[PDB]
Amino acid sequence: DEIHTIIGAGAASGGQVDAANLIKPLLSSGKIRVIGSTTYQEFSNIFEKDRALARRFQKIDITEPSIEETVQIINGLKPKYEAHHDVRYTAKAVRAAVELAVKYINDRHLPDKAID
Amino acid sequence: MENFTTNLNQLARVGGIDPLIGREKELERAIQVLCRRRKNNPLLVGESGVGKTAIAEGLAWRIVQGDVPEVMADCTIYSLDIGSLLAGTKYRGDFEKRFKALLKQLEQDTNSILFIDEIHTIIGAGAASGGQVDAANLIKPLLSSGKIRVIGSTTYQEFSNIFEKDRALARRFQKIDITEPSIEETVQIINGLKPKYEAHHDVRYTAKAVRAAVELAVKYINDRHLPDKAIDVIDEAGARARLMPVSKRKKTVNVADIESVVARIARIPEKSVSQSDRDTLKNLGDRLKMLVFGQDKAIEALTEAIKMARAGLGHEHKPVGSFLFAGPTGVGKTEVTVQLSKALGIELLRFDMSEYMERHTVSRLIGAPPGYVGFDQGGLLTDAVIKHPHAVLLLDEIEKAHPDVFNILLQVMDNGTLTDNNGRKADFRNVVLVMTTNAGVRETERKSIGLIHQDNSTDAMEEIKKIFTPEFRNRLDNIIWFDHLSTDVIHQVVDKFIVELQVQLDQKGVSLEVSQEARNWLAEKGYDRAMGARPMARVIQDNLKKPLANELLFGSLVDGGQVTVALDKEKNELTYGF
Numbered sequence: 001d002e003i004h005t006i007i008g009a010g011a012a013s014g015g016q017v018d019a020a021n022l023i024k025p026l027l028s029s030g031k032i033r034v035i036g037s038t039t040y041q042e043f044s045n046i047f048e049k050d051r052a053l054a055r056r057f058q059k060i061d062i063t064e065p066s067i068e069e070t071v072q073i074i075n076g077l078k079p080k081y082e083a084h085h086d087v088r089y090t091a092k093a094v095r096a097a098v099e100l101a102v103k104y105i106n107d108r109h110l111p112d113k114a115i116d
Numbered sequence: 117m118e119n120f121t122t123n124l125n126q127l128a129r130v131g132g133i134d135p136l137i138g139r140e141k142e143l144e145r146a147i148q149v150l151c152r153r154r155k156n157n158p159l160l161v162g163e164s165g166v167g168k169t170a171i172a173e174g175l176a177w178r179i180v181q182g183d184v185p186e187v188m189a190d191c192t193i194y195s196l197d198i199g200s201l202l203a204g205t206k207y208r209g210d211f212e213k214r215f216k217a218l219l220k221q222l223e224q225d226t227n228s229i230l231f232i233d234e235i236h237t238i239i240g241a242g243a244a245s246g247g248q249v250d251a252a253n254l255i256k257p258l259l260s261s262g263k264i265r266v267i268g269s270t271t272y273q274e275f276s277n278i279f280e281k282d283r284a285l286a287r288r289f290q291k292i293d294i295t296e297p298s299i300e301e302t303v304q305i306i307n308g309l310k311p312k313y314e315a316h317h318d319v320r321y322t323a324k325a326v327r328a329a330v331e332l333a334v335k336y337i338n339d340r341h342l343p344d345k346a347i348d349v350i351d352e353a354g355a356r357a358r359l360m361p362v363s364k365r366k367k368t369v370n371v372a373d374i375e376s377v378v379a380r381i382a383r384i385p386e387k388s389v390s391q392s393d394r395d396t397l398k399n400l401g402d403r404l405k406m407l408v409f410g411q412d413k414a415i416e417a418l419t420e421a422i423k424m425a426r427a428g429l430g431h432e433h434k435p436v437g438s439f440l441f442a443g444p445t446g447v448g449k450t451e452v453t454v455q456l457s458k459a460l461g462i463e464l465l466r467f468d469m470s471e472y473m474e475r476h477t478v479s480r481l482i483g484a485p486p487g488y489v490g491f492d493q494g495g496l497l498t499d500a501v502i503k504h505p506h507a508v509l510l511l512d513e514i515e516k517a518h519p520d521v522f523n524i525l526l527q528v529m530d531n532g533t534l535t536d537n538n539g540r541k542a543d544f545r546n547v548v549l550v551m552t553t554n555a556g557v558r559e560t561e562r563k564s565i566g567l568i569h570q571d572n573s574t575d576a577m578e579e580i581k582k583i584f585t586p587e588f589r590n591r592l593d594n595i596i597w598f599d600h601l602s603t604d605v606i607h608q609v610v611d612k613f614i615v616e617l618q619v620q621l622d623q624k625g626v627s628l629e630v631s632q633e634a635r636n637w638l639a640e641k642g643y644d645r646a647m648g649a650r651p652m653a654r655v656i657q658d659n660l661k662k663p664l665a666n667e668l669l670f671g672s673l674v675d676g677g678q679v680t681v682a683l684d685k686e687k688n689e690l691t692y693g694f
């Protein structure tokens with residue numbers, strides 16, 4: 001996870017600064033399949049940085065869910081939120097969290113803000 | 117945890133924590149955050165001297181007092197003594213077992229909240245021993261699981277450097293913006309703390325002294341936020357009260373003692389903190405008119421604008437004033453600026469804008485972007501102003517500057533401040549901005565065609581309107597147009613130049629007496645409406661300095677002497693023997 005964060009020094013300075021160097025040849029041989037995790041701007045600077053990894057990983061474009069999908073993820077977890085807060089949300093309230101957040105949250109994507 | 121954390125609720129119960137003054141919404145937001153199932157670790161982010169830590173203590177107070185909802189009431193907040201834990205250094209050893217014991221006690225007690233002051237020690241770091249790095253890794257899952265809650269405290273600059281750099285925390289912590297309190301709240305804070313200062317210094321303060329410390333510090337001390345600057349004024353007044361009057365021992369501090377410390381703390385004159393320099397301002401019109409001749413409307417326009425600003429009519433966030441000077445060459449448009457700064461007793465900060473024609477000016481005036489050599493500078497402009505908050509700032513020949521300088525100028529004209537590339541800011545509210553330009557010097561030599569000449573001059577100001585766009589022009593207090601010098605002015609100009617010649621001659625033991633006729637003669641020889649006063653200097657040098665130089669070096673004035681000049685009927689300079 002967050003593969004773009006181990007590009008510096010492994011978990012932290014003093015650890016495997018060469019973790020990437022150990023991974024490059026196993027990926028090349030296919031010994032361990034590796035699933036990466038980067039962000040849109042991190043990919044272009046993390047994988048493109050070194051061909052030994054850029055030429056090993058395939059890019060999958062992940063985008064946000066729609067208004068009704070945001071409602072579905074809230075509804076998926078709704079029972080937990082209700083249990084967690086000892087509350088009940090109306091169908092309208094869930095839709096409003098999504099429908100209104102897109103007019104006010106502005107900068108962060110909807111899937112989390114409607115949940116927040 | 118018994119020797120690593122401090123029970124803040126216990127401090128509130130024993131009296132270690134005082135009741136918080138104001139900040140009701142800050143405490144409510146911290147509890148709103150703590151009750152969330154996601155992102156439930158509040159972080160108090162601000163500036164030094166605003167109560168960030170006072171608020172965290174303040175929450176423990178309310179938790180104990182019973183001023184919070186039953187969900188939070190009787191929960192326990194403990195601070196983390198980072199120094200005590202790091203002290204385990206030899207090493208861990210006990211560092212790790214005790215940190216883990218702390219986490220186990222906190223994980224088991226889900227009613228426990230830690231308060232971590234100076235959070236940047238751990239977050240974005242942990243480097244103090246390195247032990248705080250895996251300690252953070254052992255905290256993160258418990259924040260996530262809802263077992264341990266953490267209230268942090270840092271500054272805006274650290275926040276960006278420590279929390280915005282780690283996604284795990286971005287998803288766990290909630291920033292709360294902490295600003296300074298009001299004037300009244302500051303007074304209440306001082307009076308709450310006050311006995312601790314009075315007891316220390318063996319002084320007592322009047323109610324007025326406390327109010328004055330808060331208000332005068334705002335007016336003149338621009339380095340900090342209210343709680344601490346006002347407290348520092350109180351403490352400084354206390355410190356001088358117990359120090360200065362050794363033979364008198366006055367025990368009560370009044371507003372007068374507050375004014376003396378504010379003047380010193382603020383780096384302003386002891387008079388100016390209260391009493392203005394009314395006479396300095398009254399005399400500007402005449403002192404400047406006696407140095408630069410013929411520009412009477414210009415001197416008055418400048419003088420009046422300064423007085424209005426000094427009278428308090430304008431905006432407190434803006435510079436003292438901002439004026440563009442323009443006109444023909446040789447007319448004193450720079451000379452008057454130099455004399456202004458002298459007349460006011462203010463140091464002149466001068467930049468020649470011809471030195472900033474490239475795109476590499478920002479890197480010098482503001483400072484290089486981080487990573488570049490020179491990022492270490494606050495910017496030549498920024499640094500000059502911070503060192504000299506009271507200043508006359510001259511940007512010579514602004515039309516030669518690379519256009520990016522205008523963005524710098526537009527910001528300052530609107531907000532009175534310029535930040536650096538590192539976090540410091542210049543305060544321009546006490547400086548006078550003068551920019552000069554020669555756009556308006558463009559002119560011709562050609563006359564009309566005919567037997568009778570007529571004036572074919574163009575309309576001045578068009579040369580400015582076509583260079584300086586409205587965004588700039590609309591933010592100036594004024595544009596001062598300077599005129600051409602008249603022949604009466606030339607006679608006055610000759611006299612000041614003759615005086616300068618005499619000063620140089622005094623250094624050699626030589627007395628020069630030029631007749632009035634000789635002066636009228638020189639005034640005529642050097643008059644040129646299109647070149648201002650610069651030709652007068654040439655005329656004097658050519659007619660008087662020249663023969664003096666020969667005598668000073670090779671002849672009769674070697675040992676000093678007498679020189680006079682008479683005018684011939686033949687229009688010759690009948691210089692004197694010696």
Ligand SMILES: Nc1ncnc2c1ncn2[C@H]1O[C@@H](COP(=O)(O)OP(=O)(O)OP(O)(O)=S)[C@H](O)[C@H]1O
Nearest residue numbers: 407408409410444445446447448449450451649650
């Ligand atoms: N009106 C005046 N009265 C007395 N002295 C003057 C006057 N104007 C200029 N001076 C003197 O001041 C110097 C010339 O000053 P300025 O005209 O201010 O130079 P400047 O500001 O750079 O403008 P230009 O357009 O580049 S020449 C010389 O020493 C003198 O000409």
Ligand SMILES: Nc1ncnc2c1ncn2[C@@H]1O[C@@H](COP(=O)(O)OP(=O)(O)O)[C@H](O)[C@H]1O
Nearest residue numbers: 136137138166167168169170171297301305343
């Ligand atoms: N309205 C207020 N009432 C009382 N104290 C305040 C108020 N506002 C700010 N403060 C100050 O807030 C706190 C700032 O310093 P503090 O929180 O103790 O530690 P730190 O220097 O790490 O921020 C002080 O306790 C207190 O002087």
